[PDB]
Design a protein around this nucleic acid. Structure first.
Ligand code: ERY
Ligand code: MG
Ligand code: MG
Ligand code: MG
Ligand code: MG
Ligand code: MG
Ligand code: MG
Ligand code: MG
Ligand code: MG
Ligand code: MG
Ligand code: MG
Ligand code: MG
Ligand code: MG
Ligand code: MG
Ligand code: MG
Ligand code: MG
Ligand code: MG
Ligand code: MG
Ligand code: MG
Ligand code: MG
Ligand code: MG
Ligand code: MG
Ligand code: MG
Ligand code: MG
Ligand code: MG
Ligand code: MG
Ligand code: MG
Ligand code: MG
Ligand code: MG
Ligand code: MG
Ligand code: MG
Ligand code: MG
Ligand code: MG
Ligand code: MG
Ligand code: MG
Ligand code: MG
Ligand code: MG
Ligand code: MG
Ligand code: MG
Ligand code: MG
Ligand code: MG
Ligand code: MG
Ligand code: MG
Ligand code: MG
Ligand code: MG
Ligand code: MG
Ligand code: MG
Ligand code: MG
Ligand code: MG
Ligand code: MG
Ligand code: MG
Ligand code: MG
Ligand code: MG
Ligand code: MG
Ligand code: MG
Ligand code: MG
Ligand code: MG
Ligand code: MG
Ligand code: MG
Ligand code: MG
Ligand code: MG
Ligand code: MG
Lengths: 96, 8, 64, 51, 76
RNA sequence: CUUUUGUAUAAUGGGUCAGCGACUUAUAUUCUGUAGCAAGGUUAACCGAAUAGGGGAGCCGAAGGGAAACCGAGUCUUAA
RNA sequence: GAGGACCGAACCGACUAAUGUUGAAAAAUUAGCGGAUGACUUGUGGCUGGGGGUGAAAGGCCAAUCAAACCGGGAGAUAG
RNA sequence: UUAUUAAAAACACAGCACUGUGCAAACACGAAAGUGGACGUAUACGGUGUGACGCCUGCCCGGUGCCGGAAGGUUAAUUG
RNA sequence: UUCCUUGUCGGGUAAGUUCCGACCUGCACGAAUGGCGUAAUGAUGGCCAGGCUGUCUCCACCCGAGACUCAGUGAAAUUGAACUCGCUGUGAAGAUGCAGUGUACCCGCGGCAAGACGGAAAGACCCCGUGAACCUUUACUAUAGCUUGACACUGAACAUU
RNA sequence: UUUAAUGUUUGAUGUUCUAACGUUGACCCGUAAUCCGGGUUGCGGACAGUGUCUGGUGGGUAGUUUGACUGGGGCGGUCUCCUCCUAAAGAGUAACGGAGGAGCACGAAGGUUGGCUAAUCCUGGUCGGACAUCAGGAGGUUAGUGCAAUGGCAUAAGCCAGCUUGACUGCGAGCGUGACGGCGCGAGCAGGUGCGAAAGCAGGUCAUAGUGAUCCGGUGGUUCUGAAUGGAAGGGCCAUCG
């Protein structure tokens, strides 16, 4: 970063923001991960037992990425608007 | 050598 | 040993979706009264780092 | 130099204010203008206070 | 001993010459006063910069009873 | 030979011969080449009649946007 | 028969000139020179130690080393 | 007196002065215990400056230092 | 101690920027970081004279120790390689080596130092280094020591406010 | 508001006292001993002295700083921004080259509607003169522009008056100029306004100087976060100050 004694670029420019502690304990699930559990029910503890999310994760979201073919029940997770349609289009059901 | 003896 | 992050650069740059970096504009901390409103309005959103300075940021952020 | 910064406080409930400068000595009366308040989106009388 | 001062160059002058196709909003000339004047589809900024307000070709002409130089834009 | 705009230079260095004498090593990181596997790839410590086999704890990757809560093929800005 | 008296050997010093200057010698020889009963000179032992000593004071001297001794470590200091 | 390019007009000096110090002295070396001063006691001891002897040593207390004074202004820890 | 300055005048000399005496225009003396005198002293600074002389005019001769030759023993600094002349020009601007030109048979010995920008010591002067050391101060920050009060070791009684 | 009063908290200074503490006063013992310790006595005495905290003084000692450009360095100048020339008719272009300015001002000196036109000179006229106010004529910008110089300005950007706060909030196609950080021009949209009958014009001022990154903080606001949980502190974001 040394620029000859001129004030360098990472120090003429201002700092911004703060780090959220809640962002580190939250994950996102894709539609390709819903067929990698065993039981056909998808909650937080089945996603942890299949090594999909980490052990410190306390919140998760299913997003529209990839595809799901099987009937799947989702328990206690958040679902996006398009992924609720895609889980219900494959015969699944979403409850909180 | 004591060089400072040289007259400058 | 591991490379250490320049921790003051990690407080000023964030990596975007294709590998560029964003930063907050300068000149918006104090004497704001004498400045025009159009000038202060354009300094509010975040910008991208130019091409010539990207390698200097990459040197500061080996783990970004 | 001589010209002192003030600010114009909105007479609506909002905390919004404009800032400007004013010669304290030739014009000792309080400045007062109708300016756009962006929180309630109307033109309200604004009044001078200290910076 | 008494001198030694000068200002920075302002890069004034003509940016788009005659017949060049420009986009709307393009700066045609930077000037101090109105050395050139605004014609059809040509605006004048607050520092007398002449810019394009439509797409087309730059046209220079001398008009009026004072023989002043005008800058216009002819749509292509 | 070196150093310089420029050296036969009267600028530097070497009397000669033989032997020794200066871009390495560790760990991280990125780019390139090549090989394996491929929406997946790979294990560390450790266990192990031990370069085998086990061990997936973890790491990187398939999704981003925002300061963030949060939303999510979008998101942020804004009353829009 | 006094004297920091006088002349002058031993004894202690070092003013002048020549010489030597890969010396006979890392400070000397030759010829002249000052003091020579005193604040003299010398043998033997002892004490004062490095930002410290000691100094009738020249930053002098502390083992041919001094505007901060020598030896060993930090140490392969650092050298645009 | 600058061992080893300076021996002098430089240093010291007897004499003069100012200043401190009442003795568990002032002061100095010592985390301290102690020691020197001194087995001394103001006719003494430390510091400073001048420098035998003769004639002398004029004016200035505004600045800095030092000695004295305490009305008043300001002012820490502490209390809250 | 005086820059201008060898100030001006007198003395000493045939001739004196030094010396001695005096003047006063003290660039910029002066009273104990002393002023001004002063006998005696000084391997102290300056100036004049008599004696004396190779200091000199202007050198000559002699006596010894080297230098020289014979025998024995036997260094050193330096050194890119050398078949290592002059002059005028050229040229990283002062040429043994380049150009033109002139002179020059090969090799020693005793002498002298004009050149080899001769030898010797990575210039002490000067500049530079975001180099060092030590010294100064009313530079910055600290601090030993000295000094101020509070609490502690630390208590009893009695007055005044 | 003052006084004096009884019960009552200290705070101080003063005077006595001895029992802490000092004793480098005397005497005895250990003891063959000017150390030291114990004992007995005198003098002092809650002082002095030491510890923690704190104000002053503190080259006695220590660690450090003490800019660069420069026809060598020093001494002297200068160091950012604006205008003209050098600058060779696009932009840019050096010198310790030739010449001058800035570190503001203004709620009107800003917006709009309506209107208007200068210097200098001559001629006649009360004080009035070389120069005031007035009338006429010449003239044509030789004036004016808030402050330098240049380029502009009559459809006036110059002068005068009525009304006003657009010297607005969120944005912005597209361009100019910089190694960058940054700086500049801008039609057009959304909301809400001023002037005008209306077309329209208005996001400061004829343009170009009138300025300082970051950090650390201060002050208001906010539908963000809040280390067991509910808050709060602190942080973020927006506006703004040093
Ligand atoms: C006895 C024996 C010694 O020689 C001397 O003392 C002679 C008498 C010096 O006198 C001289 C005498 C005096 C006048 O110089 C003649 C004076 O100028 C110098 C400082 O000392 C010389 C010669 C000096 O020369 C001159 O040094 C000058 C700095 C530069 C000059 N030249 C490069 C330009 C150079 O020749 C310089 C320092 O001593 C020589 C250095 C290298 C030494 O150390 C010398 C060789 C010693 O070792 C030597 C053995 O001891
Ligand atoms: Mg802010
Ligand atoms: Mg070389
Ligand atoms: Mg090299
Ligand atoms: Mg050179
Ligand atoms: Mg080169
Ligand atoms: Mg050169
Ligand atoms: Mg050549
Ligand atoms: Mg050579
Ligand atoms: Mg040389
Ligand atoms: Mg050599
Ligand atoms: Mg060799
Ligand atoms: Mg294995
Ligand atoms: Mg979008
Ligand atoms: Mg005698
Ligand atoms: Mg004698
Ligand atoms: Mg001698
Ligand atoms: Mg002798
Ligand atoms: Mg003798
Ligand atoms: Mg000295
Ligand atoms: Mg000493
Ligand atoms: Mg010695
Ligand atoms: Mg040292
Ligand atoms: Mg080294
Ligand atoms: Mg080290
Ligand atoms: Mg000597
Ligand atoms: Mg001696
Ligand atoms: Mg001598
Ligand atoms: Mg001598
Ligand atoms: Mg002597
Ligand atoms: Mg003394
Ligand atoms: Mg004296
Ligand atoms: Mg006082
Ligand atoms: Mg005379
Ligand atoms: Mg005289
Ligand atoms: Mg004197
Ligand atoms: Mg006096
Ligand atoms: Mg005196
Ligand atoms: Mg006297
Ligand atoms: Mg004499
Ligand atoms: Mg004579
Ligand atoms: Mg011989
Ligand atoms: Mg022989
Ligand atoms: Mg020749
Ligand atoms: Mg020649
Ligand atoms: Mg040749
Ligand atoms: Mg030839
Ligand atoms: Mg000779
Ligand atoms: Mg040669
Ligand atoms: Mg030489
Ligand atoms: Mg020579
Ligand atoms: Mg050198
Ligand atoms: Mg200080
Ligand atoms: Mg203390
Ligand atoms: Mg110091
Ligand atoms: Mg310099
Ligand atoms: Mg100079
Ligand atoms: Mg600049
Ligand atoms: Mg040009
Ligand atoms: Mg105006
Ligand atoms: Mg202007
Ligand atoms: Mg909490």
């Amino acid at each position: 970063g040394f620029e000859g004694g001129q004030m360098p670029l990472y120090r003429r420019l201002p700092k911004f923001g703060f780090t959220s502690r809640k962002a580190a304990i939250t994950a996102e699930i894709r539609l390709s991960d819903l067929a990698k559990v065993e039981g056909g029910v998808v909650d937080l503890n089945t996603l942890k037992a299949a090594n999909i999310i980490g052990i410190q994760i306390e919140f998760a979201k299913v997003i529209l990425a990839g595809e799901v073919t099987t009937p799947v029940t989702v328990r206690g997770l958040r679902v996006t608007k398009g992924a609720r349609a895609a889980i219900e289009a494959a015969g699944g059901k979403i409850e909180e | 050598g004591i060089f400072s003896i040289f007259v400058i | 040993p591991k490379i250490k992050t320049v921790r003051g650069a990690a407080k000023r740059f964030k990596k975007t979706g294709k590998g560029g970096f964003k930063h907050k504009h300068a000149n918006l901390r104090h004497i704001l009264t004498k400045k025009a409103t159009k000038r202060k309005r354009h300094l509010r959103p975040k910008a991208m780092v130019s091409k010539g300075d990207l390698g200097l940021v990459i040197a500061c952020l080996p783990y970004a | 130099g001589i010209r002192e910064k003030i600010k114009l406080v909105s007479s609506a409930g909002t905390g919004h204010f404009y800032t400007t400068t004013k010669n304290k000595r030739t014009k000792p009366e309080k400045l007062e203008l109708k300016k756009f308040d962006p929180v309630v989106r109307q033109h309200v009388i604004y009044k001078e206070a200290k910076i | 001993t008494r001198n030694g001062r000068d200002s920075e160059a302002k890069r004034l002058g003509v940016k788009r010459f005659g017949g060049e196709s420009v986009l709307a909003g393009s700066i045609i000339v930077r000037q101090r006063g109105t050395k050139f004047h605004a014609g059809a589809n040509v605006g004048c900024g607050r520092d007398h910069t002449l810019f394009a307000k439509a797409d087309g070709k730059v046209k220079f002409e001398v008009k009026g009873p004072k023989n002043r130089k005008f800058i216009s834009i002819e749509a292509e």
